[PDB]
Design a protein around this motif. Structure first.
Motif, short mmCIF file in Angstrom:
data_model
loop_
_atom_site.label_atom_id
_atom_site.label_comp_id
_atom_site.label_asym_id
_atom_site.label_seq_id
_atom_site.Cartn_x
_atom_site.Cartn_y
_atom_site.Cartn_z
N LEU A 22 0.81 -1.21 0.00
CA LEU A 22 0.00 0.00 0.00
C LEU A 22 0.85 1.26 0.00
N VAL A 25 1.68 1.74 -3.52
CA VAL A 25 0.49 2.23 -4.20
C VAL A 25 0.35 3.74 -4.00
N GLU A 42 -7.13 -1.42 5.05
CA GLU A 42 -6.70 -2.73 4.57
C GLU A 42 -5.30 -3.10 5.03
N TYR A 46 -1.58 -7.29 5.94
CA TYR A 46 -0.14 -7.47 5.77
C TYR A 46 0.62 -7.31 7.08
N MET C 52 -19.79 1.06 0.67
CA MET C 52 -19.06 -0.11 0.18
C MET C 52 -18.13 -0.67 1.25
N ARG E 24 -17.40 -2.10 -8.12
CA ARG E 24 -17.55 -3.51 -7.79
C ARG E 24 -16.92 -4.40 -8.86
N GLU E 27 -13.16 -4.23 -8.70
CA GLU E 27 -12.69 -5.09 -7.62
C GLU E 27 -12.73 -6.56 -8.03
N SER E 28 -13.77 -6.95 -8.77
CA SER E 28 -13.85 -8.31 -9.27
C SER E 28 -12.70 -8.62 -10.23
N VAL E 31 -8.17 -8.74 -8.18
CA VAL E 31 -8.38 -9.57 -7.00
C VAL E 31 -7.63 -9.00 -5.80
N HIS E 32 -6.37 -8.62 -6.00
CA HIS E 32 -5.51 -8.21 -4.91
C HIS E 32 -5.89 -6.82 -4.41
N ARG E 33 -5.67 -6.59 -3.11
CA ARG E 33 -6.19 -5.40 -2.46
C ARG E 33 -5.42 -4.14 -2.85
N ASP E 34 -4.09 -4.23 -2.94
CA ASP E 34 -3.31 -3.05 -3.29
C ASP E 34 -3.58 -2.62 -4.73
N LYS E 35 -3.64 -3.58 -5.65
CA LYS E 35 -3.98 -3.27 -7.04
C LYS E 35 -5.37 -2.67 -7.14
N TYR E 36 -6.32 -3.22 -6.38
CA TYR E 36 -7.67 -2.67 -6.39
C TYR E 36 -7.69 -1.25 -5.84
N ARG E 37 -6.93 -0.98 -4.78
CA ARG E 37 -6.88 0.37 -4.23
C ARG E 37 -6.32 1.35 -5.25
N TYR E 38 -5.23 0.97 -5.92
CA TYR E 38 -4.64 1.83 -6.94
C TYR E 38 -5.64 2.12 -8.05
N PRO E 78 -18.88 -11.60 -12.18
CA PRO E 78 -18.49 -10.74 -11.06
C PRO E 78 -18.66 -11.45 -9.72
N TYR E 79 -17.98 -10.91 -8.71
CA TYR E 79 -18.16 -11.41 -7.35
C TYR E 79 -19.54 -11.03 -6.84
N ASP G 26 -16.43 -18.14 -3.40
CA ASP G 26 -15.59 -17.52 -4.41
C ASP G 26 -14.13 -17.47 -3.95
N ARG G 28 -11.89 -15.34 -5.10
CA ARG G 28 -11.42 -13.97 -4.99
C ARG G 28 -11.46 -13.44 -3.57
N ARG G 107 -7.99 -12.17 1.95
CA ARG G 107 -8.99 -11.31 1.33
C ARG G 107 -10.39 -11.56 1.86
#
Ligand code: CDL
Ligand code: CDL
Ligand code: PLX
Ligand code: PEE
Ligand code: PEE
Ligand code: 8Q1
Lengths: 84, 175, 88, 124, 178, 70, 165, 128, 63, 104, 459
Positions: A22, A25, A42, A46, C52, E24, E27-28, E31-38, E78-79, G26, G28, G107
Motif C-alpha cells: 500500500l 500504491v 486494509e 499485511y 461499500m 464492484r 474489484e472483481s 483480486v488483490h487489495r493493493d492493485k484494487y486500491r490503486y 463478477p463477485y 468464491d 477472490r 482477502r
C-alpha cells in the motif's frame, strides 16, 4: 456452550500503511497527484501472521526436509541390514 | 443335491486345486473362513437339523398330475365344438411345456457361460448349438401367431410351411 | 455455522472502527450521530465508498435505494441491526 | 513418430500400410525361416484361462507369474522375478514386431528402387 | 428493499449507481487489495473530472458512453455476496420460514408446551386487534383524495397509535429461523 | 467435539499444536513415500528396457539382398 | 477407483474451506490459508499432486498408464493431442486452485472464524489422505494382470505425461 | 468507441443502454408518475386487505382470474378462420401424421420384403 | 458394550438368516448359484481326483 | 421474470409479481425456472458463431484424425495356434487354412 | 359370480334404510367387505377361463379390473364424505345410490359372456356418471361437459350396435367363446372395412383416441372428486377391454387398418405430454396425462402381440391407481384453496410435509420409476413397438422425457418454493385424506411384488 467471551477490538491507531505494498500504491498515486483514502483500512492484511508468504514451490515442498531425513535413515538401515 | 436331476442339469466334475503355500506367512483367508464356520455354519446347521426333525415328525405327500392324450385339431370336424375345445386345451398345455423346455436350455447356456469363465467362447459350443436347434424349432412352431393364437392358426402355418417345402423339393428334384 | 451472536454494541464499534480508519474524516470530530454531508463535509461519492466499506466489513450488501439515504453512523447501525435481527 | 511425417507428408507408396502388413512373402528375404515356438500346450493354457488377447507366445511366463501370485498370496511382492521374465518376453516380442516392420519397409524400399531402375533401363 | 421506490431516478442517482457498479466490477477484476486500491483511486480521479460540469445536455451525453464502456468490460462473472440475489445462498433458508398464523392450528397438547409464549402471542393479538381499527380510520383520513400517489406510509401521530400496516412487517419469521 | 477458540478480528487465528504436527507429519510421510518408491522402483518412471534403433540393424538379419538377386 | 479417493478428498478440503469462511465459495475472497489452517492445506496439496499423476501416488498408477496406452495405440492423432492438452490444463487449474486459495494475502472479511480443531473433520480427511497416498500401490500390486504391458517405449514418449504436466 | 451489443429475442437490451430513458420530456415524467400512482393504489388495496385481522381466507386476484380465463376459455369465441390460421392448423395437424405414416410404412415394407426374401437372419428372435 | 450388541443385532443376525436362506433354499434349485471355475496351473493336484497336472515343456531360461 | 427487480418488495417474492398487476400471457414460460431473457455480456449472434464454430472445427479435426491416424513402427501382433482359431468361435470340424508366424 | 353381484345390490336397501348419520360408515365397511370377496377371483388358470354360468365368466384380464372396480368404491366414499357435509340425507343417499349402481353396471360389464349384454351394460354405465357430473358439480360448465361426454360416446357406439346385430345375423352367435373358437378371416373389402370401423370406433372414442379426446378434459375438470376418480380409473379401461375382446374377429384386416390410429396415438402422446407442460389447472394436466397413457395403451392394443397385451393390462391397472391418487391430491388442495389453479398455492411442503411425501410418491409412480408396474407396462409396450418397428423408439423416448418433465413440474410448482403470503386457511391434513392416499399407494407397491396378477391371460 457457545462463544460468548466479549471479544474486544484492537486499537485503530495500530494499522499503518508503512511496510506494505500500500505504501508503493500511495507512492505511485502521488506521482499523479492522488491519494488512497482507505489505505489504512486494509493494512491488517499485511501486518500480523499474514506478513510472511510462501512460494508455490515452497508450498509443494511442505514436508520435504523431514521426509528426506527419514528416507536417508531408512535407506541406511536397509543397506546395513542387507549387507549381512 | 437330490432335489433336482443331474441329467437334466449337467455339471462338470468341478476339479479344484489344492492349497500349496509357498511362504511361511499365515494367510488371513483361512483364519477368517474358520471363524466364519464356527460363528455361522454351526448354529445354522443346528437350526436346520431341528427344523428337519420337526418336519420328519409330520410327513405328507403331494403328487404330479398326469394328463391323458386327446385327439388333436387335425382330426376335428369343421363345426364340432367339443373336440375343438379339447384339442385347444391340449395344444395350450403343449405350448407351455415347450416354453419351459426352452427355459431349461437357456438356463443351461447361462450356467455354462458363467462357469467356463474366460474360455466360454470355446468351452460352451455344445450348449450354444443345442440352444440354436431348440430356438429354431420353437420359432418355427409358434412365431407370428399373434395375441389371439390357437391350434387352428398353428396348423395353418404348418400347412403352408409343408406346402412350401414340398414345392421346393419338387422343383429341386425336377431341376 | 458457529457464528457468535453479534450485538448492537459490536455493530456500532465496528462501524466506528471502519470510519476511524477512513483518513478523510478526522477521528475526534465524528460522533455516532455525526452527519456526513454537513457535520464532516464529505462528498456523495465519499458516502457511497463508505457504504461499500461497510458492505465489505459486514459481509452483506445493502441495496442502492436503501444505501443512498443512509447519512449517519447511527442509522447505519440501525439498518444493519434491523437487517440481521439483532436483539440487544 | 518420424514415420508419421514421412508417410503423410512424403511418399505414401514409399512406406507400408500397417493394416495390410506384411506385403511380401516370408521367404522373400532368406530361405532359412526358422519357426516360432510354443511352450504352453492347448489344454493347460485353456485351464489357466488367461484371456484371448493374453494368449500369445509369452503365455508360459504369465502362467508362472500367476502360479506365484496364487501361491504366495499375503506376500504380494514375493515373486518379482517372474514379472521381470514376463516383461522381458513381451519386450522381445515387441522388438521382433519392430524388426518385422523395419524389414518390410526396407524390402519396399529395394522393390521401388528395382522398378525405377528397370524404368530407367527401358527408357535408355 | 425497505424504502419505497420513486417514480424515476435522477441523474445524480444514476451516476452514483454506475460508480458503484464500476467499482464492484473493478474489484472483481483486480483480486488483490493493493492493485484494487490503486485502480479504484484512478477510477475516482477519472470519475470526478466532470464533477463541475453544468449544462444538462453534455451531462446526459456523458454517463452513456460510460455505461457502454462498462458493458463492454463488465467481467461476465463478477463477485456476488452469498446472500445477494445472485449469490450461492440467496434463498437457502427460505424453506425454514413458517408463517406466524400456523401456531393457531397447533393441537392443545402442543400448545400445552410453551405456555408463556402463547400468552404473549395472545397479548400481541389483542394489541393488533385494537390497533387495526385505529389504523383503518387514520389511513382513511390521511390519504389524499383520488388514491395514493406513492407507496409510502405515514407513521403514527397520536399517543397510543401504532404505525399503519405494521403486523406483517414486525412479525417476520426470521432471517435464519432454523 | 472440539475445543473453544474465539474469533480474532483482523489478527492471525489461534492454532493448536496438534493440527500443525499432524499436517507436518503427513506431508513428511508423503514425501518419504515418494522418495522410498523412487529409490526401490526406479524403472516405473524411466523404464527398464532400452528402445532399439531400427536404422542400426544390419541388413543381414533383415533379409536384404544387394538389389540384384531379387 | 483412484479418482474416487482423491476427488472425494478434494471436495472435503473445499467444503472445509467454505465452512471456515462463513459459507463463502468464491476464490477472490480467500487469501492466505497455507498457515491459517494447515491440515486442509496439506490435504489439498496431496490431493492436487495425486490428481496430476505425481509419481508413486494414487493418481500415478492409473493416469500414467492411461497416457502410455493412448500414446502407443492405433488411434486418432487429434484425440491424443486433446488428451495431452487436457492433462496440461489439469495441472494448470490445480495450480490455479492452490495459488488463489492458499498463497496470497488474506482477502476474507475481518472477523476471522477460521477453525479446524474438530476430530470428525480431521479423521475423515486423514483416512482419505492415507487412501490417496497408498491405495494405488496396494491395489496395483494386489490385483492379477489383465492386459499386455507396454514394456519398451521411446524415452521421450515415456516422459510425455510428466513433461506436459 | 467499443464494439456494440446487439440484442435478440432471448437476450434483451439492458436498461442502461436504452436511448429512450435519456429522452426525457414532461410527458414522460407524468406517465411515470401516473404509472407509480396506479401501482401504489393497487399496493394500498392489497395491503389493506392483507393486514386485516378479520380476514381468514384467500385474497381473490382479478388479474389471475383474467389470465386463466383468457388462456383457457376466451380462445374459441375470439377465433376467426383466416388463411394464417387455416394454413398453420392444416400443417401442424396433418403434416406430422403423414410424415410418420410414410416413414413407418416404408420401414415396414422394407422389413416385409426382406422377410419374404428370407435374408433377415431372425435367429433367437422368440419373443415379440 | 454398545458395539457388542450392535455387532450381534446388525451383523450376526442378518448373516445367520442369509446363510440359512442360501444354504438350504437357494441352492435347493439348480444353477441358482453358479461359481467361476477355479484356475488350474501346471503342477497342481486335485482334491477330488488326486491326479497331478504334468509340468510344462522346460522352456530355455535365461535372464 | 428473472430480470425483474430483485430488490422491490413484491407481494410474491418468488414469482416477482404484484397483486392486481396484469399478467403476461406467457407467465408460465418465464418463471425463473424456465427460459429467461436476461441480457448477456456477449451478444447472441457472436455467442452462436463462437459456439458453432468451435463445434464444427472439433468435428472436422476429428474426421481428419480419422483420415490420418497415429500408430507405432511395429508389425501386427502374432498369435500361435492358427490365429487362435479354436478358442475364437471354434468350428473344429473344418480344418482351416493354417497360418504360421515369421521369426526374425 | 352372483356372490359378488348380490351384495352389491343389497348395498342399496342398506343405504336407504340406514340412519341419517351412519350411511358413510356402513357403506364403507360393506364396500370393503365386498372387495375382499372379489380377491378370490384373481386365482386364475392358464387354461380357457372361469366359466361360472351361461351369462357370466371371469378371466385374468377381467379379474384385475373387477378387483380395482370393487376397491375403488370405498375410496370414492371417503373422498366424497367431505364436500357433501351440508347436503340433505336424501340427496346423500341418492349420491351413494349412483355410485353403487355404477359399480354394479361395471361388474356386470366385465364378465358379460355375450356381446349384446356387454353393450347394454357398457351403455348403462353412462347414466349414473352423467347424473353425478351434471347434478353434484360445482361450476356452470358441468352441463356442457355432460353433453359432450354423452354425445361423443353415443355417436361412437351407435354403429357398434348395428355391427353387432349384423355379426350375430351372419355368424349366428355373439357368445365370446363361440366367437373365439369359430373365428374366420376378414376379406379386404369395403363392407369389411366399414364393419371394422364400426367395431373399433366405439372403443376408440372412450380410450380416448387423440383427436377424439375433447370430452375428457371437460368431464374430468367439471366432475366431483368421486366422478373424476371413477372416470380416470375404470371408465377409460372399458374401451381397452372391449378392443381386446373384439380384435379377435378383425383379423387380418387389422394389419393395415391400424395405421391411421397408430399414427394418431404415437403423435398424440407427444402432443398431450407437451400440452401438459403449459397448463394452469391441476385437473386438466392430470386429464391430459391420462390421455397420453391411454394413447400408448391404444398403440399396445393395435400392435396385437402377447407382450403388447401384457403391457397394456399392466399399464391400465397402474394408470387407474395413479390417476385416482393424483385426482385425490388435487381435490385435497382444492377444498382448502377453492381455486383449482397451480400458481396460487405454492410451497405446500413447508406447511404439509406428509402430503408432500404423498405428492412425491404419486409423481414418481406417474413418472414410471422402476420397478413399479407403470414401468413394467411401459417397457413391455415399448419393446413390442420396437419389434414392430425400430423407429418407434424415438417417439417413445420423447414421450418418456416429456412425461418426467411435466410430472416434476407439477410437483415443484405446488410443493416447492415460497408459500403464498395471503393464504392463511391451510389447516393440517386430516386423517381421512392421509388414509385415502395410503390406500391408493400401498396396493401399487404390493402389486409390484406379484406382477403376474395383472399381466393378463397371455402371461
Ligand atoms: C385429428 C388429429 C390432429 C388433426 C389436426 C386438426 C387439423 C384439421 C383442421 C384443418 C383445417 C384447415 C383447413 C380449414 C378450411 C379452410 C377454409 C376455411 O376454414 O374457411 C374460413 C375462411 C373463409 O372466410 P371468408 O369470409 O371467405 O374469408 C376470410 C379470409 O380472411 C379471406 O381470405 P382471402 O379472400 O384472402 O382468400 C384468398 C385465398 C387465400 O390465399 C392464400 O394466401 C392461401 C392460399 C394457399 O383463398 C384461396 O385461394 C383458397 C385456396 O377461409 C379463408 O379465409 C382461408 C381459405 C384458404 C385456406 C386453405 C385451406 C388450408 C388447406 C387445408 C387442406 C388440407 C386437407 C383438406 C382435406 C379436404 C379433403 C378431406
Ligand atoms: C431400498 C430398500 C428399502 C428397504 C427398507 C424398507 C422400506 C419400507 C417402505 C415401504 C414403502 C413406502 C410407502 C410410501 C409412503 C411412505 C410413508 C411415509 O410417509 O414415511 C414416513 C416415515 C416417518 O417419517 P416422518 O418424519 O414422520 O415424515 C416426515 C416426511 O414424511 C418426510 O419424509 P422423507 O423426507 O423421509 O420422505 C419419505 C420417503 C418415503 O416415501 C417414498 O417415496 C418411499 C416409496 C418409494 C417408491 C416410489 C415408487 C417407485 C417404484 C418402487 C416400487 C417397488 C416397491 C417394492 C415393494 C414394496 C412393498 C410395499 O421418501 C424418500 O425417502 C425418497 C424415496 C426415493 C427412493 C427411490 C428408490 C426407489 C427404487 C429402489 C428399488 C426398490 C426395490 C429394490 C430391488 C433391487 C434390490 C432387491 O418415514 C419413513 O419411514 C420412510 C419410508 C422408508 C423409505 C423407503 C425407500 C425405499 C423403500 C421402497 C419400498 C420397499 C422396497 C423393498 C426392497 C427391500 C429390500
Ligand atoms: C378427426 C379426428 C380423428 C377421428 C378418427 C380418424 C380415423 C378414421 C380413418 C379411417 C381409416 C382409413 C379408411 C379406409 C382405409 C382403406 C385403404 C384405402 O383408403 O387406401 C386406398 C383406397 O383408395 C382410395 O383411397 C379410395 C377411397 C377414396 C375416398 C375416401 C375419402 C378420402 C379422405 C376422407 C377422410 C375423412 C375422415 C373423417 C370423416 C368425417 C387403397 O387403394 P385400393 O386398392 O383401391 O382399395 C383397397 C381396399 N379394397 C381392397 C377394399 C378395395
Ligand atoms: C432432445 C431434447 C429436446 C429439448 C427438450 C426441451 C424441454 C423444454 C422444457 C424444459 C423446461 C424449461 C427449463 O427446464 O428451463 C431451462 C433450464 C434452466 O436454465 P439454467 O441454465 O439451469 O439457468 C438457471 C440459472 N438461472 O435449463 C435446462 O435444464 C434446459 C436443458 C435443455 C437441454 C437441451 C439440449 C440437449 C441437446 C443434446 C445434444 C447432444 C446429444 C447427445 C450426444 C451423445 C453422443 C453419444
Ligand atoms: C366419434 C364419432 C365416430 C362415429 C363412428 C364413425 C365410423 C362409423 C362406422 C361406419 C358406419 C356404418 C357401420 C356399418 C355397420 C356394420 C354392418 C356391415 O359391416 O355390413 C356392411 C355394410 O356396410 C355399409 O353399408 C356401410 C355404409 C356406410 C353408410 C353410413 C356412413 C356413415 C359415415 C361413414 C364415413 C365415416 C366413417 C369413419 C368416421 C371416422 C371418425 C369420425 C356390408 O353390408 P352388406 O350389404 O350386408 O354386405 C355386402 C355384400 N352384399
Ligand atoms: C470495470 C468497469 C469499467 C469502468 C467504466 C465506467 C466509466 C465511468 C466514467 C464516467 C465519469 C462520469 O462521472 S460522467 C459525467 C456526468 N455528469 C455529471 O457528473 C454532472 C454532475 N455530477 C453529479 O451530479 C455527481 O452526482 C457528483 C457531483 C459526482 C456527486 O454528487 P453528490 O454530491 O450528490 O455525491
Amino acid at each position: 456452550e457457545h462463544g460468548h467471551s466479549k471479544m474486544e477490538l484492537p486499537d485503530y491507531k495500530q494499522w499503518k500503511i508503512e511496510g506494505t505494498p500500500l505504501e508503493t500504491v500511495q507512492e505511485k498515486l502521488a506521482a499523479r497527484g492522488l491519494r488512497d483514502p482507505w489505505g489504512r483500512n486494509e493494512a491488517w492484511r499485511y501486518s500480523g501472521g499474514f506478513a510472511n508468504n510462501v512460494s508455490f514451490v515452497g508450498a509443494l515442498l511442505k514436508g520435504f526436509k523431514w521426509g528426506f531425513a527419514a528416507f536417508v535413515v531408512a535407506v541406511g538401515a536397509e543397506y546395513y541390514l542387507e549387507s549381512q | 443335491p437330490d432335489s433336482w436331476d443331474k441329467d437334466v442339469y449337467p455339471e462338470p466334475p468341478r476339479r479344484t486345486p489344492a492349497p500349496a503355500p509357498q511362504t511361511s506367512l499365515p494367510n488371513p483367508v483361512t483364519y477368517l473362513t474358520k471363524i466364519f464356520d464356527l460363528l455361522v455354519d454351526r448354529p445354522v446347521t443346528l437350526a436346520r437339523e431341528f427344523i428337519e426333525q420337526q418336519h420328519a415328525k409330520n410327513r405328507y405327500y403331494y403328487y404330479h398330475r398326469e394328463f391323458r392324450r386327446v385327439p388333436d385339431i387335425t382330426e376335428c370336424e369343421e363345426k364340432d365344438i367339443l373336440c375343438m375345445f379339447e384339442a385347444e386345451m391340449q395344444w395350450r398345455r403343449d405350448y407351455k411345456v415347450d416354453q419351459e423346455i426352452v427355459n431349461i436350455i437357456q438356463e443351461r447356456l447361462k450356467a455354462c457361460q458363467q462357469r467356463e469363465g474366460e474360455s466360454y467362447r470355446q468351452n460352451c459350443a455344445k450348449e450354444l448349438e443345442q440352444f440354436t436347434q431348440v430356438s429354431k424349432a420353437f420359432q418355427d412352431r409358434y412365431s407370428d401367431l399373434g395375441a389371439h393364437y390357437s391350434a387352428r392358426k398353428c396348423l395353418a402355418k404348418q400347412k403352408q410351411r409343408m406346402l412350401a417345402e414340398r414345392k421346393a423339393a419338387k422343383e429341386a428334384a425336377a431341376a | 455455522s458457529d457464528a457468535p451472536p453479534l450485538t448492537l454494541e459490536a455493530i456500532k464499534d465496528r462501524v466506528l472502527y471502519v470510519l476511524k480508519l477512513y483518513d478523510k474524516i478526522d477521528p475526534e470530530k465524528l460522533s455516532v450521530n455525526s452527519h456526513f454531508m454537513k457535520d464532516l463535509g464529505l462528498d456523495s461519492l465519499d458516502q457511497v465508498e463508505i457504504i461499500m466499506a461497510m458492505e465489505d466489513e459486514f459481509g452483506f450488501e445493502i441495496p442502492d435505494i436503501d444505501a443512498e439515504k443512509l447519512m449517519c453512523p447511527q442509522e447505519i447501525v440501525d439498518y444493519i441491526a434491523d437487517k440481521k435481527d439483532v436483539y440487544e | 513418430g518420424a514415420h508419421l511425417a514421412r508417410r503423410y507428408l512424403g511418399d505414401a507408396s514409399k512406406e507400408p500400410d500397417p493394416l495390410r502388413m506384411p506385403t511380401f512373402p516370408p521367404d522373400y528375404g532368406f530361405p532359412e525361416r526358422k519357426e516360432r515356438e510354443m511352450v504352453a500346450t492347448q489344454q493347460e493354457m485353456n485351464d489357466a484361462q488367461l484371456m484371448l488377447q493374453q494368449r500369445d507366445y509369452c503365455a508360459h511366463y504369465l502362467i508362472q507369474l500367476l502360479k506365484c501370485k496364487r501361491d504366495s498370496f499375503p506376500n504380494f511382492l514375493a515373486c518379482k522375478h517372474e514379472q521381470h521374465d514376463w516383461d522381458y518376453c513381451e519386450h522381445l516380442d515387441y522388438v521382433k514386431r519392430m524388426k518385422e516392420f523395419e524389414r518390410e519397409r526396407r524390402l519396399l524400399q529395394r522393390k521401388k528402387r528395382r522398378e525405377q531402375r528397370e524404368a530407367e533401363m527401358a527408357r535408355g | 428493499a425497505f424504502s419505497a421506490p420513486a417514480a424515476y431516478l435522477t441523474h445524480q442517482q444514476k451516476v452514483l449507481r454506475l460508480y458503484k457498479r464500476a467499482l464492484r466490477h473493478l474489484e472483481s477484476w483486480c483480486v488483490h487489495r493493493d492493485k484494487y486500491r490503486y485502480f479504484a483511486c484512478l477510477m475516482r480521479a477519472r470519475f470526478d473530472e466532470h464533477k463541475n460540469e453544468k449544462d444538462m445536455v453534455k451531462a446526459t451525453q456523458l454517463l452513456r458512453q460510460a455505461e457502454e464502456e462498462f458493458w463492454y468490460g463488465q467481467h461476465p462473472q463478477p463477485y456476488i455476496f452469498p446472500e445477494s440475489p445472485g449469490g450461492t445462498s440467496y434463498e437457502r433458508y427460505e424453506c425454514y420460514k413458517v408463517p406466524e398464523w400456523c401456531l393457531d392450528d397447533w393441537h392443545p397438547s402442543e400448545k400445552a408446551m410453551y405456555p408463556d409464549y402463547f400468552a404473549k402471542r395472545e397479548q400481541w393479538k389483542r394489541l393488533r386487534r385494537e390497533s387495526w381499527e385505529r389504523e383503518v380510520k387514520q389511513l382513511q383520513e390521511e390519504t389524499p383524495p383520488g388514491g395514493p400517489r406513492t407507496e409510502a406510509l405515514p407513521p403514527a401521530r397520536k399517543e397510543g397509535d401504532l404505525p399503519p400496516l405494521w403486523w406483517h412487517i414486525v412479525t417476520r419469521p426470521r432471517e435464519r429461523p432454523m | 467435539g472440539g475445543v473453544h477458540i474465539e474469533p480474532r478480528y483482523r489478527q492471525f487465528p489461534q492454532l493448536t499444536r496438534s493440527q500443525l504436527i499432524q499436517a507436518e507429519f503427513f506431508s513428511a510421510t508423503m514425501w518419504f513415500w515418494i522418495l522410498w518408491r523412487f529409490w526401490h522402483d526406479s524403472d516405473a518412471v524411466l523404464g527398464h528396457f532400452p528402445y532399439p534403433d531400427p536404422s542400426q540393424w544390419t541388413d543381414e538379419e533383415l533379409g536384404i539382398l544387394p538389389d540384384d538377386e531379387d | 477407483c483412484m479418482h474416487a479417493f482423491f476427488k472425494a478428498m478434494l471436495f472435503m478440503c473445499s467444503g472445509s474451506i467454505i465452512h471456515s469462511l462463513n459459507d463463502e465459495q468464491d476464490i477472490r475472497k480467500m487469501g492466505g490459508l497455507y498457515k491459517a489452517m494447515p491440515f486442509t492445506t496439506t490435504a489439498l496439496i496431496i490431493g492436487s499432486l495425486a490428481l496430476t499423476g505425481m509419481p508413486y501416488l494414487t493418481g500415478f498408477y492409473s493416469k500414467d498408464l492411461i497416457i502410455e496406452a493412448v500414446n502407443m495405440s492405433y488411434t486418432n492423432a487429434w484425440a491424443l493431442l486433446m488428451t495431452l492438452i487436457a492433462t496440461s490444463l489439469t495441472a494448470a487449474y490445480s495450480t490455479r486452485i492452490i495459488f488463489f486459495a492458499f498463497l496470497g494475502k488474506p482477502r476474507f472479511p475481518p472477523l476471522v472464524l477460521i477453525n479446524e480443531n474438530n476430530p470428525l473433520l480431521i479423521n475423515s480427511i486423514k483416512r482419505l489422505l492415507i487412501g490417496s497416498i497408498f491405495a494405488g500401490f496396494i491395489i496395483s500390486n494386489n490385483i492379477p494382470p489383465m492386459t499386455v504391458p507396454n514394456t519398451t517405449m521411446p524415452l521421450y514418449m515415456k516422459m510425455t505425461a510428466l513433461i506436459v504436466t | 468507441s467499443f464494439p456494440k451489443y446487439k440484442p435478440s429475442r432471448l437476450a434483451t437490451l439492458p436498461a442502461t443502454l436504452d436511448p429512450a430513458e435519456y429522452d426525457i420530456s414532461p410527458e414522460t415524467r407524468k406517465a411515470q408518475a401516473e404509472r407509480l400512482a396506479i401501482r401504489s393504489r393497487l399496493k394500498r388495496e392489497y395491503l389493506l386487505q392483507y393486514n386485516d385481522p378479520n380476514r381468514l381466507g384467500v385474497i381473490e386476484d382479478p388479474a389471475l382470474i383474467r389470465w386463466t380465463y383468457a388462456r383457457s376459455a376466451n380462445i374459441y369465441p375470439n377465433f376467426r378462420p383466416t388463411p394464417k390460421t387455416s394454413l398453420l392448423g392444416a400443417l401442424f395437424g396433418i403434416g406430422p401424421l403423414f410424415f410418420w405414416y410414410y416413414v413407418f410404412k416404408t420401414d415396414r415394407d422394407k422389413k416385409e420384403k426382406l422377410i419374404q426374401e428370407g435374408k433377415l437372419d431372425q435367429t433367437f428372435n422368440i419373443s415379440y | 458394550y454398545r458395539h457388542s450388541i450392535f455387532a450381534v443385532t446388525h451383523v450376526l443376525i442378518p448373516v445367520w438368516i442369509i446363510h440359512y436362506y442360501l444354504k438350504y433354499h437357494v441352492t435347493a434349485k439348480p444353477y441358482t448359484v453358479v461359481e467361476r471355475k477355479p484356475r488350474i496351473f501346471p503342477g497342481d493336484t486335485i482334491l477330488e481326483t488326486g491326479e497331478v497336472i504334468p509340468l510344462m515343456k522346460e522352456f530355455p531360461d535365461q535372464h | 421474470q428473472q430480470e425483474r427487480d430483485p430488490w422491490y418488495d413484491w407481494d410474491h417474492p418468488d414469482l416477482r409479481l404484484n397483486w392486481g398487476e396484469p399478467i403476461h400471457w406467457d407467465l408460465d414460460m418465464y418463471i425463473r425456472n424456465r427460459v429467461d431473457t436476461s441480457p448477456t455480456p456477449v451478444s447472441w449472434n457472436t455467442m452462436c458463431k463462437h459456439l458453432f464454430g468451435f463445434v464444427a472445427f472439433m468435428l472436422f479435426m476429428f474426421w481428419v484424425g480419422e483420415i490420418y491416424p497415429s500408430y507405432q513402427p511395429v508389425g501386427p501382433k502374432q498369435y500361435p495356434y492358427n490365429d487362435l482359431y479354436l478358442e475364437r468361435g471354434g468350428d473344429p470340424t473344418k480344418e482351416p487354412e493354417p497360418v504360421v508366424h515369421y521369426e526374425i | 359370480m352372483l356372490k359378488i353381484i348380490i351384495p352389491t345390490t343389497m348395498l342399496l336397501p342398506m343405504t336407504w334404510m340406514s340412519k341419517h348419520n351412519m350411511i358413510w360408515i356402513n357403506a364403507t365397511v360393506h364396500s370393503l367387505l365386498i372387495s375382499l370377496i372379489s380377491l378370490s377371483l384373481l386365482n386364475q388358470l392358464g387354461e380357457n377361463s372361469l366359466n361360472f354360468s351361461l351369462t357370466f365368466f371371469s378371466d385374468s384380464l377381467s379379474a384385475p379390473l373387477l378387483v380395482l372396480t370393487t376397491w375403488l368404491l370405498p375410496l370414492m366414499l371417503m373422498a366424497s364424505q367431505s364436500h357433501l357435509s351440508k347436503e340433505t340425507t336424501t340427496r346423500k343417499k341418492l349420491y351413494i345410490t349412483m355410485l353403487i349402481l355404477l359399480q354394479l353396471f361395471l361388474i356386470m360389464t366385465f364378465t358379460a359372456t355375450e356381446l349384446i349384454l356387454f353393450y347394454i351394460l357398457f351403455e348403462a354405465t353412462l347414466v349414473p356418471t352423467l347424473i353425478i357430473i351434471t347434478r353434484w358439480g360445482n361450476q356452470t360448465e358441468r352441463l356442457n361437459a355432460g353433453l359432450y361426454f354423452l354425445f361423443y360416446t353415443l355417436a361412437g357406439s351407435l354403429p357398434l350396435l348395428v355391427a353387432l346385430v349384423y355379426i350375430q345375423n351372419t355368424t349366428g352367435s355373439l357368445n365370446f367363446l363361440i366367437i373365439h373358437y369359430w373365428s374366420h378371416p376378414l376379406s379386404n373389402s369395403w363392407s369389411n372395412i366399414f364393419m371394422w370401423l364400426a367395431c373399433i370406433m366405439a372403443f376408440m372414442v372412450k380410450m380416448p383416441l387423440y383427436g377424439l379426446h375433447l370430452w375428457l378434459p371437460k368431464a374430468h375438470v367439471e366432475a366431483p372428486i368421486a366422478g373424476s376418480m371413477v372416470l380416470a380409473a375404470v371408465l377409460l379401461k372399458l374401451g381397452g377391454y372391449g378392443m381386446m375382446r373384439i380384435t379377435t374377429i378383425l383379423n387380418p384386416l387389422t394389419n393395415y387398418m391400424a395405421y391411421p390410429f397408430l399414427m394418431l396415438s404415437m403423435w398424440g402422446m407427444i402432443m398431450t405430454s407437451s400440452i401438459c407442460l403449459r397448463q394452469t389447472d391441476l385437473k386438466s394436466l392430470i386429464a391430459y396425462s391420462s390421455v397420453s397413457h391411454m394413447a400408448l395403451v391404444i398403440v399396445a392394443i393395435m400392435i396385437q402381440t402377447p407382450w403388447s397385451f401384457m403391457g397394456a393390462t399392466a399399464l391400465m391397472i397402474a394408470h387407474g391407481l395413479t390417476s385416482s391418487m393424483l385426482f385425490c391430491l388435487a381435490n385435497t388442495n382444492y377444498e382448502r384453496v377453492h381455486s383449482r389453479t397451480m400458481i396460487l398455492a405454492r410451497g405446500l411442503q413447508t406447511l404439509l410435509p406428509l402430503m408432500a411425501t404423498w405428492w412425491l410418491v404419486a409423481s414418481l409412480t406417474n413418472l414410471a420409476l422402476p420397478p413399479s408396474i407403470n414401468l413394467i407396462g411401459e417397457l413391455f409396450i415399448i419393446t413390442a413397438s420396437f419389434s414392430w418397428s425400430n423407429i418407434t423408439i424415438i417417439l417413445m423416448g420423447m414421450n418418456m422425457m416429456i412425461t418426467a418433465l411435466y410430472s416434476l413440474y407439477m410437483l415443484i410448482t405446488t410443493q416447492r418454493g415460497k408459500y403464498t403470503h395471503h393464504i392463511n386457511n391451510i389447516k393440517p391434513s386430516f386423517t381421512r385424506e392421509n388414509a385415502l392416499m395410503a390406500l391408493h399407494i400401498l396396493p401399487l407397491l404390493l402389486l409390484t411384488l406379484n406382477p403376474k396378477m395383472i399381466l393378463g391371460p397371455l402371461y
